[PDB]
Every structure is written in C-alpha cells, then in structure tokens.
Amino acid sequence: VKKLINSQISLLIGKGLHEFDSLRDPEVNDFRTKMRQFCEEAAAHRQQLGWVEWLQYSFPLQLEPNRALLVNVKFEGSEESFTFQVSTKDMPLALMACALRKKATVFRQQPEEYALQVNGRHEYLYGNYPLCHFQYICSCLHSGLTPHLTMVHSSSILAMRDEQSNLWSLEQPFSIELIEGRKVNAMKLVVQAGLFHGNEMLCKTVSSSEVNVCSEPVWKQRLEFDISVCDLPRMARLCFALYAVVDCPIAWANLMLFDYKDQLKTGERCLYMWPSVLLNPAGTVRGNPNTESAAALVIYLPEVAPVYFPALEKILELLREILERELYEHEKDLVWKMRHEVQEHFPEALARLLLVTKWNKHEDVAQMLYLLCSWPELPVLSALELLDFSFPDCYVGSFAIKSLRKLTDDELFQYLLQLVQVLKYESYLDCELTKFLLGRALANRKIGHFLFWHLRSEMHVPSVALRFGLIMEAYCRGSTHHMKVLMKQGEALSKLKALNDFVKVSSQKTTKPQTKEMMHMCMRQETYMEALSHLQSPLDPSTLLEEVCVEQCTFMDSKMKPLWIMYSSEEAGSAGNVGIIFKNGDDLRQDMLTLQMIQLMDVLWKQEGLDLRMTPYGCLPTGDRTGLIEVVLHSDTIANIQLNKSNMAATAAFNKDALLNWLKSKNPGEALDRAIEEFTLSCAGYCVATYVLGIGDRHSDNIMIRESGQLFHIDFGHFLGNFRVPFILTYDFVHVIQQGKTNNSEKFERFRGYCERAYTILRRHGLLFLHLFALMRAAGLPELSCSKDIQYLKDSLALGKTEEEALKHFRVKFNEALRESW
Numbered sequence: 001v002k003k004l005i006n007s008q009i010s011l012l013i014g015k016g017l018h019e020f021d022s023l024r025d026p027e028v029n030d031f032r033t034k035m036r037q038f039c040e041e042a043a044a045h046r047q048q049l050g051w052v053e054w055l056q057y058s059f060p061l062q063l064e065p066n067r068a069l070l071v072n073v074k075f076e077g078s079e080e081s082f083t084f085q086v087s088t089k090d091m092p093l094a095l096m097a098c099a100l101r102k103k104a105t106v107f108r109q110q111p112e113e114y115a116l117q118v119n120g121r122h123e124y125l126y127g128n129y130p131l132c133h134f135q136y137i138c139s140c141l142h143s144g145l146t147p148h149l150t151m152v153h154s155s156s157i158l159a160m161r162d163e164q165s166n167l168w169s170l171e172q173p174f175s176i177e178l179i180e181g182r183k184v185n186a187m188k189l190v191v192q193a194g195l196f197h198g199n200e201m202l203c204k205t206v207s208s209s210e211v212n213v214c215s216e217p218v219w220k221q222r223l224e225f226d227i228s229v230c231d232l233p234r235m236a237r238l239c240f241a242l243y244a245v246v247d248c249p250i251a252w253a254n255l256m257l258f259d260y261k262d263q264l265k266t267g268e269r270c271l272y273m274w275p276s277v278l279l280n281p282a283g284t285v286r287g288n289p290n291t292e293s294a295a296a297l298v299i300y301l302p303e304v305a306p307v308y309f310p311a312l313e314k315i316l317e318l319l320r321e322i323l324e325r326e327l328y329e330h331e332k333d334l335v336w337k338m339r340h341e342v343q344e345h346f347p348e349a350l351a352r353l354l355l356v357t358k359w360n361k362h363e364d365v366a367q368m369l370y371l372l373c374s375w376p377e378l379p380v381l382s383a384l385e386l387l388d389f390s391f392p393d394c395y396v397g398s399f400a401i402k403s404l405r406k407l408t409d410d411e412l413f414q415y416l417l418q419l420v421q422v423l424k425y426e427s428y429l430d431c432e433l434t435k436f437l438l439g440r441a442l443a444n445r446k447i448g449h450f451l452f453w454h455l456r457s458e459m460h461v462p463s464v465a466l467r468f469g470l471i472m473e474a475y476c477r478g479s480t481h482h483m484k485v486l487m488k489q490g491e492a493l494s495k496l497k498a499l500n501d502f503v504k505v506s507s508q509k510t511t512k513p514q515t516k517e518m519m520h521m522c523m524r525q526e527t528y529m530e531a532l533s534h535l536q537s538p539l540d541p542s543t544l545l546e547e548v549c550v551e552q553c554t555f556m557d558s559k560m561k562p563l564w565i566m567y568s569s570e571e572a573g574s575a576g577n578v579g580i581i582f583k584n585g586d587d588l589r590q591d592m593l594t595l596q597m598i599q600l601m602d603v604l605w606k607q608e609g610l611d612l613r614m615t616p617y618g619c620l621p622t623g624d625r626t627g628l629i630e631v632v633l634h635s636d637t638i639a640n641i642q643l644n645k646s647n648m649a650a651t652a653a654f655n656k657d658a659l660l661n662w663l664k665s666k667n668p669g670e671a672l673d674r675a676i677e678e679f680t681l682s683c684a685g686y687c688v689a690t691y692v693l694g695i696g697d698r699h700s701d702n703i704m705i706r707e708s709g710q711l712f713h714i715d716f717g718h719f720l721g722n723f724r725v726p727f728i729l730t731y732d733f734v735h736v737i738q739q740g741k742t743n744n745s746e747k748f749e750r751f752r753g754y755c756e757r758a759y760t761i762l763r764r765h766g767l768l769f770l771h772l773f774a775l776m777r778a779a780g781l782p783e784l785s786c787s788k789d790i791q792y793l794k795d796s797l798a799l800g801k802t803e804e805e806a807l808k809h810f811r812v813k814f815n816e817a818l819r820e821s822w
C-alpha cells in the first residue's frame with residue numbers, strides 16, 4: 001500500500017524515488033523526512049475542516065476584481081428544476097432560500113446548509129457577495145446566457161472531504177588548492193574563480209596559471225583570496241570558470257562555502273561542471289548529474305582546526321530623501337550612516353540600504369542584520385523586490401517571505417509563476433520559500449494544481465530535476481487524493497503525446513482527410529477513450545473534461561502538427577463544450593508569461609473600473625516542449641476572415657469591409673453596436689499591451705476575433721523589442737472602430753481615450769511589472785536574461801517621467817501610429 005503510493009508518486013513526477021536514495025546524501029534525506037512531516041500535518045488539518053472551509057480549500061471562490069436576471073436551479077439527485085427571476089444584487093442565500101420554497105411547494109412540504117455548484121464544473125457560489133461579483137454570474141450576463149446551478153447539501157460536501165482522506169576567529173585570507181580536472185578541448189586552459197554574494201563580488205577575481213590543453217589537467221596551486229575568512233558572509237558563493245586561450249569558454253561550476261548545517265567546508269571536493277553557452281554567479285550550486293561525461297574539477301578547502309556560522313543570538317549581541325525615490329559613492333555612505341533613520345522613518349527603503357551594506361565586512365553585516373530584526377513588515381510590492389538574487393542573505397529572504405504571507409490566494413496565484421522561478425536561485429534544498437509554497441498549496445487546491453504543473457513541466461531540465469522532484473514528492477505525501485487526480489491528467493497527456501507522434505508520421509505519407517480518419521480510429525481504441533476522458537483540465541482545475549468527441553477532434557496540418565481536442569458534458573450542458581489544443585515540439589513558456597502579464601493588466605484595469613473585454617485564455621507547459629492551450633470557441637483568425645470568400649454572409653465589394661461584414665452576420669439588428677464596442681475596447685487593450693511589452697510582428701495570421709466582437713492575440717512569440725517597437729494601428733481595425741465610415745472622429749477619439757486610460761493605469765503599477773520581470777530572469781528565457789530587457793519596460797512605461805510628460809510622449813507614439821495606418 002505504501003509501496004503502491006511510492007510507485008504512483010514515481011510515475012507522476014517522472015523520476016523514480018529510488019534515485020533519491022541512491023545519492024546517499026544527508027541533505028536530500030533531511031529535506032525528505034522533514035518536508036514529509038510538514039505535509040502530513042497539513043493533510044491532517046484538512047481532514048477535519050468544516051464543510052464551508054473545505055469548499056474554500058477545494059473550490060476556492062472565483063470573483064471579479066438593481067438589475068434582474070434569470071437563473072435555473074435544481075437539486076443534486078433530480079433532473080426537475082426551477083427557473084427563478086432574481087436581482088444581480090442578491091446574495092446566494094436569497095436564491096437558495098428561494099429554491100427551497102419551490103421544493104417545499106412541489107413536494108407539498110435552512111438555506112445555510114447548502115452551496116450552489118455551477119453545473120458540470122468544480123465551481124461553487126457561496127459567501128456574502130452579490131451574484132454579479134462571481135465571475136460565473138458576471139460572465140453569464142455578458143454573453144446573454146442563463147446561469148445554471150445545483151443546490152448541494154452540506155452532508156454531501158462532507159462526503160467529498162471524507163472520501164479524499166490519506167566564526168570571527170579566522171583572520172587569515174581565504175584560499176583553495178586547485179588540484180586537477182578531466183575534460184575535452186582544442187592552445188592552453190585557465191581556471192578563473194570569484195567569491196560572490198549575489199551579483200556583487202566580495203573581492204577581485206583571481207586567475208590560474210596557463211597549462212596546455214592536453215588533459216586530464218594538473219595544477220597543484222594555491223589560489224588565495226583577498227578577504228579574511230572570518231568575513232565570509234553566511235551565503236558566500238565560490239564560483240569557477242574553465243576556458244581555453246592562446247577566448248573560448250568550456251565549462252563553469254559553483255558551490256556554497258558553508259553546507260546546509262551552517263558548517264564551513266573541508267577538505268577535498270570534486271566539482272562536476274556544466275557546459276558554457278565566464279563566471280556564472282547565478283548558476284545552481286549543485287554539480288552536473290551527468291558525471292560520466294561531465295568535465296570535473298578537483299579542489300581542496302583547507303581545514304582550519306569544526307567551524308559553524310554564529311547563532312543569531314551571537315549576531316544580535318554584536319538630501320537623503322532627494323535621492324531616495326543607482327547612486328554615487330558619497331550618496332552610499334550617507335545612507336549607511338542614516339541606517340537607523342532609514343529604519344524608523346523610511347522602512348520602505350530597506351532594499352536600497354541592503355544594496356549599500358558591505359557584505360564583505362562581517363562587522364557591518366551584524367549591523368544590518370540587527371536593524372533587520374526589528375524592521376517593520378513591508379508591503380507585498382516591496383517584498384517581491386527583496387526576493388531578487390541581489391539579496392541572497394537568508395535573513396533577508398526570511399523577512400521577505402514573512403512580509404509575503406499577507407498575500408491573498410488570488411494574489412499568490414497571480415505571481416506563482418515568478419515565485420516558482422525564484423526556486424532556481426536558492427542555495428539549499430530546505431528553505432523558507434519551499435515551505436511557504438507547499439503550505440499555501442496544501443491549503444488551496446488550485447495553488448496545489450499549478451504549483452505541481454509549473455514543477456512537473458521542468459523535470460527534463462537537469463539543473464532543477466532533483467529540487468523540483470523532491471517538492472512534488474512532499475506535495476503528494478500531503479495530498480494522496482490530488483496525486484491520483486493529477487495521475488489521471490498525466491496519463492491523458494501521455495496518450496496525447498502518442499497520438500501526436502502518429503499524426504506526425506501519418507500526415508507525411510497521406511492526405512489530411514486520411515490522417516484525420518486515422519486519428520479518430522486511434523482515439524476510438526478503449527485505452528485512449530478512457531485515458532482521454534473524465535479528467536480535470538490541466539489548464540483550469542474547475543473545468544471538467546468529460547466525453548472526448550472524437551468526431552470534432554483534428555490537427556492542424558503544419559509544422560509541429562498540434563492537435564485539437566473537443567469535449568462535451570451533458571451535466572454542464574453548453575458550458576461543458578470545451579476544447580484543448582495539444583502542442584508538442586514548441587516551447588510555450590514565453591507565451592504563458594506574456595499571457596499572465598496581459599491578464600495582470602486586465603485585473604489592474606478592472607480595479608480602476610475599466611473593462612477592456614480581454615481574452616485571458618489558458619496556456620500551460622506540461623513537459624519538455626509540451627503543453628496545452630485553451631480553445632476559445634466561436635473565434636476565427638483575421639487572415640481567414642480577410643480571405644473574403646464568396647457564398648458567405650460576409651462577402652465584400654471592398655476587402656476592407658470583410659471584417660465588418662463578418663461582425664454584421666454574427667450580430668444582426670441592434671446587436672451590431674455592442675459588438676463594435678466590444679471590438680473597440682478589446683483592440684485598445686491589446687494595442688497598449690503589445691506596445692508596453694515590446695511585441696511586434698503582429699499580423700492577420702496571429703490575431704483573432706470572437707463572434708461577440710472581442711479581438712485577441714495569439715502566438716507572440718518575441719517580446720521586449722528583440723525581434724524599440726512602435727505602437728501599432730492597423731487600418732482594418734480603425735475602419736471597424738469607425739463603424740465603417742471614412743471619417744468618424746467621435747468614435748476614433750473614444751478609442752484614443754481607452755488607450756490613454758489603459759496606458760496611464762499601467763504606469764501607476766510600473767514597479768509591479770519591473771519586480772515581476774526581475775524575478776523572471778531566473779527562468780533562463782533567452783529574451784529575458786540581461787538588463788537591456790528590463791530597460792525596455794522602463795522605456796515603455798516612461799516611469800522616470802511625470803504623468804503629464806509620459807502621456808504627451810505616448811501621444812506622439814499614437815499619432816505616429818495613425819500616420820502609419822495607410
């Protein structure tokens with residue numbers, strides 16, 4: 001039983017648990033038993049949750065950031081239903097109280113014992129909120145549709161829960177012996193080394209003597225470092241680069257100078273190096289696992305006797321404003337002297353003080369830390385900055401995590417991609433970020449879901465495979481049931497991979513109709529119908545994927561041959577008609593990031609009362625160049641529509657009418673007006689988002705429209721101006737915005753306003769994007785690695801300007817776009 005589970009975990013995470021044992025590594029072992037313990041208690045806590053509290057755990061509320069409506073309501077075990085008319089202002093309780101009246105009359109004769117499930121989804125309506133505040137009711141209003149709900153009794157929710165149970169002495173300089181290696185090249189080889197605390201060096205780098213390429217290299221030399229051993233900060237990182245010269249880089253490697261138990265390191269180490277793209281401070285501090293083939297350096301840390309880092313108990317014993325909103329060396333010195341008044345009267349400037357503190361002198365670090373221990377808790381915004389690699393100290397990190405606990409679950413979810421990436425910066429396996437993510441994920445099943453997937457999707461990256469593998473193991477121990485739910489997902493993804501391979505093979509040797517019918521036969525096999533059916537969507541756990549409609553599935557006959565998979569569900573009706581796209585061969589990470597950023601804009605816009613009718617569709621990497629994109633139904637590409645085919649509702653006398661004609665046929669009579677407004681709002685949002693993000697090569701192939709008028713972007717797949725990208729107005733959208741008239745300055749200028757509001761609201765949260773992109777640097781995305789990428793956002797949001805200033809600047813950009821539009 002505990003052997004079945006171990007095997008289930010092994011299959012789910014894509015790494016066998018026996019591989020953890022074989023490392024005979026006490027840090028891995030200690031991480032495992034402690035994190036198992038932590039996760040088991042969390043699971044125990046959850047099995048006694050109240051029924052409302054469980055709903056909160058398993059089906060967290062989906063909310064928006066007088067008027068009448070129709071609702072259909074039924075009860076759990078009957079098909080008979082009642083249609084009521086209520087107010088968009090009424091709470092779920094009144095509707096429930098209403099539904100119980102109708103039952104008592106029909107069956108010839110307490111609302112608070114129920115919750116309302118959205119039919120055929122894992123989504124529930126409860127709490128003291130007006131119906132219009134629930135994403136679902138809210139969404140229903142905009143599309144016309146009647147909300148459909150089931151009354152579920154508390155006794156039934158509890159049955160769900162139950163079924164789901166489980167020191168300063170050493171004054172001599174620091175130094176190492178560089179012994180030998182075993183490697184491949186073409187000329188002479190040099191080892192260069194630096195001591196780092198984040199990006200900042202703790203002293204100058206020191207180089208090797210030249211030795212010939214023939215090697216199996218030999219050195220037997222002492223590299224001495226210009227810094228007292230008693231000064232090495234807790235998080236001292238020692239870094240190596242091996243290269244050749246008569247410059248040609250070969251490999252690099254890093255390690256911490258203290259182990260995970262705070263002990264200084266001795267004596268001999270063998271470092272298995274990673275291939276190079278010279279010093280790489282940000283690289284992992286674990287050696288290359290491919291030890292058969294990896295070049296290796298042998299070194300020797302010299303025993304100065306054990307020696308540990310001193311307990312905090314010991315450590316605790318031991319024109320300003322005009323600048324405070326990069327600084328000269330005299331400005332630095334001023335801040336440091338003011339550290340106390342910084343604490344008392346500028347607590348939000350912590351980050352700036354941390355960057356001036358001298359991490360290569362131990363006495364100053366004791367100073368800074370002592371101030372940190374009484375430092376007031378900081379705003380989330382400020383805390384997200386502190387998580388950056390320019391703050392490696394474990395005390396700083398703990399303060400940051402401590403400031404971050406006041407994150408709501410909706411916020412945490414919004415920034416989960418970045419917090420996971422920042423695991424790649426960590427020095428050690430057991431850390432505060434890991435416990436934090438595990439804890440919040442075990443308290444919220446939606447967080448759990450995406451945490452799992454963000455980690456699972458990277459298991460083929462050797463630098464994170466062990467770390468990420470271990471976290472998912474701990475997660476599973478805390479939720480046996482959710483483990484199985486995710487296995488169902490992994491098995492579906494495994495079959496889709498097999499199905500996509502067949503399509504790639506078949507389609508090269510036969511015509512599209514022929515392969516299509518083959519795909520269907522392949523899907524109609526028992527093993528497939530079953531593996532592909534009855535799962536939660538990896539794109540959204542509240543979306544249930546029930547019956548694959550084989551007949552509606554296809555593939556696109558191009559490059560990587562992505563698959564199109566439709567689902568239906570009687571229980572959910574029209575709402576359970578949903579689709580996924582499976583893509584294998586392409587990397588989806590950049591698109592996911594882009595889409596999260598756009599969805600962030602939408603939330604920020606909505607919090608100022610601006611709704612730009614965005615389309616934040618699912619996009620999720622699940623494996624090695626593998627993931628999923630959510631089908632947005634009732635949509636088509638601008639290119640396709642602009643083919644202006646005859647025999648169609650939308651056939652134009654002039655190609656420029658095509659897109660308007662299409663909208664007309666989808667939205668007759670008085671419906672046309674709202675579709676044009678939907679188009680205008682959505683167009684403004686994507687124009688501003690693409691501009692702020694530096695995304696170009698937009699064209700009719702990678703823009704789409706919904707039948708409601710909503711325009712949205714797909715397949716980005718470059719950003720931050722690396723292809724300065726101009727603002728873009730396509731004449732074809734301008735034509736539609738203008739209701740089909742040559743001149744319509746009343747409509748075009750309401751459009752300009754939309755853009756100007758959207759843009760000015762983002763500037764107010766400019767720092768949030770900057771902090772978020774800074775952390776994303778951890779992802780290893782080629783287009784998001786250096787500072788010229790961050791600078792791109794600095795320039796697009798004109799953060800160093802006044803709002804009047806930037807708004808004029810933006811107005812020049814917009815007018816330039818208008819001229820470019822024919």
Ligand SMILES: CC(=O)Nc1nc2ccc(-c3nn(Cc4cc5ccccc5nc4N4CCN(C)CC4)c4ncnc(N)c34)cc2s1
Pocket residue numbers: 554555556562563564581583586587588591617629630631632633635636637640714715716717
């Ligand atoms: C790296 C990368 O590819 N990123 C990508 N991101 C996206 C995002 C969206 C889409 C996408 N593309 N399309 C058009 C489309 C894509 C198909 C993909 C695989 C198989 C069949 C496909 N058919 C598509 N159409 C074209 C329009 N037609 C009316 C319906 C079917 C979408 N339709 C609805 N929802 C979507 N989300 C899409 C594709 C991609 S690819």
